[PDB]
Ligand binder design. Structure first.
Ligand SMILES: O=c1ccn([C@@H]2O[C@H](COP(=O)(O)O)[C@@H](O)[C@H]2O)c(=O)[nH]1
Ligand SMILES: O=c1ccn([C@@H]2O[C@H](COP(=O)(O)O)[C@@H](O)[C@H]2O)c(=O)[nH]1
Ligand SMILES: O=c1ccn([C@@H]2O[C@H](CO)[C@@H](O)[C@H]2O)c(=O)[nH]1
Ligand SMILES: O=c1ccn([C@@H]2O[C@H](CO)[C@@H](O)[C@H]2O)c(=O)[nH]1
Ligand SMILES: O=c1ccn([C@@H]2O[C@H](CO)[C@@H](O)[C@H]2O)c(=O)[nH]1
Ligand SMILES: O=c1ccn([C@@H]2O[C@H](CO)[C@@H](O)[C@H]2O)c(=O)[nH]1
Ligand SMILES: O=c1ccn([C@@H]2O[C@H](CO)[C@@H](O)[C@H]2O)c(=O)[nH]1
Lengths: 76, 75, 76, 75, 77, 75, 74
């Protein structure tokens, strides 16, 4: 039982809102639909935020894992 | 269900997409094919800047390591 | 003496400081990690030069962004 | 089910292409061959800067990791 | 002659200097390392421009940030 | 019939080449050998800047990941 | 009969060399060993920051992925 590895723990967020910070300072929010071991992700109803402003609505999007800094839980 | 990201990408073949690259370039076009490295081939592609078409390229091969995200966007 | 990734096991459930490429810093409790150095922290906070820029809660950090990991001190 | 990207690139062999590299740099030439890393060999290659030719290089081997995209040239 | 990573073993338990990409630098006692060059330092301190910016205690440094590793000096006395 | 890039490079052994690196450094010398990572050994190597020889290095080993492209020097 | 690059590098063992790094740092010293990643150990190492000595290091282990080129010194 003693603690899931990080990529297994990530599965606990499937179908939940998440916050993704990317290299280069970009930030996105959306519902996590799937991921793989490279940390590539597919999000639904995604938006890109900038200085607290939604600067773009990305709909369903695939984010390439090597651009990611961190993934955290979003409002909800 | 829910396919892994690279399998789910198959559902976008023949759909219009928006590709954002590292370093800010953006491309819009119809996804024709892809592979495991995320290398992509788009038809009727154009490069954009600030919501502006700066170049019309037709069919282009995009190297996968340059990709930040692939979006299906909004109507 | 344990190899680096095995010694890190010593910090599970302990407060840590994660310094990233770009000067961003995270402080939180280490819950798990994997061989790529991907990490899960609980009660995490993000910092931009001593200033707590955000309270994340549980967060997954991609290992390729890490510069170092050191011992921190727990919150209240 | 169409060709994977690197298999489709084979249809441009002996044709004019535009190679965009990271850093606004760009090459034009006839595609002679390539490999799985996307390293390429171009004939009658010319390097460009802001639409203007900077150097005529002749045959050139370009390392794949420098590539942003490949498109066809109107040559 | 030993290969680089094998010769590094001779520096275990000795003070070293770790120069990183971007110029920071760490000084401390080398406790262990692995084949990716990740390493563990005891009594570590971070420096920038030669001035110590913080004392970290025991630290795990990810290897791909390393430029070089050399030996450190002991206190002037 | 169509030599892959790294096999074709072998045809430049012992001839003058020009190597452009990331960050715009440029070297010229006689290609002596190379490997699959594109690491190279050059004889009579010279570093160039702006267009002028800024350094004479003799025999040099260049690490492949720094390379942008390799082309033929002058006879 | 030419040796592959990493094999040709063996010829410089126990000889003075110049190591130029990504960014721009430069080191001079005697090459003692290396591995397939191009990590190197130099003896009597000295760093040069634009034409001249800025730091004497003694023995140093340079990580291979930082290297741009290696040439014969002196
Ligand atoms: O689908 C893919 C394939 C590779 N990659 C990246 O390519 C590298 C592949 O190996 P890695 O997953 O162990 O890091 C690494 O930088 C990955 O993030 C993706 O991000 N997505
Ligand atoms: O000790 C190490 C481990 C990896 N590396 C680097 O990591 C990569 C590993 O691939 P390589 O085994 O082909 O050299 C490559 O870019 C290396 O230069 C080092 O330089 N030193
Ligand atoms: O045709 C290819 C081959 C590889 N890569 C990926 O791009 C990076 C280039 O250094 C590698 O990590 C590799 O996974 C591509 O994008 N396209
Ligand atoms: O999910 C993953 C998979 C791999 N890596 C590591 O990060 C680097 C990304 O290029 C690789 O060398 C790999 O070892 C991660 O940080 N996270
Ligand atoms: O001769 C070589 C060796 C490696 N690579 C890089 O190493 C990765 C191997 O998949 C590719 O993405 C590619 O960019 C090259 O471009 N050329
Ligand atoms: O814990 C790790 C795992 C990977 N890497 C780096 O990631 C790449 C994984 O193949 C290597 O080149 C290596 O430099 C590290 O520094 N530390
Ligand atoms: O001596 C070496 C070893 C590796 N590489 C490059 O660094 C990557 C290491 O996995 C490979 O794709 C390879 O092209 C070099 O340039 N030189």
């Amino acid at each position: 039982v003693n603690v899931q590895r990080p990529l297994d723990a990530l599965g606990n967020s499937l179908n939940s809102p998440v916050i993704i910070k990317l290299k280069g300072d970009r930030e996105f929010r959306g519902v996590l639909k799937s991921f793989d071991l490279h940390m590539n992700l597919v999000l639904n109803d995604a938006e890109e935020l900038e200085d607290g402003e939604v600067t773009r609505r990305l709909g369903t999007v695939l984010i390439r894992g090597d651009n990611i800094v961190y993934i955290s839980r979003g409002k909800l």
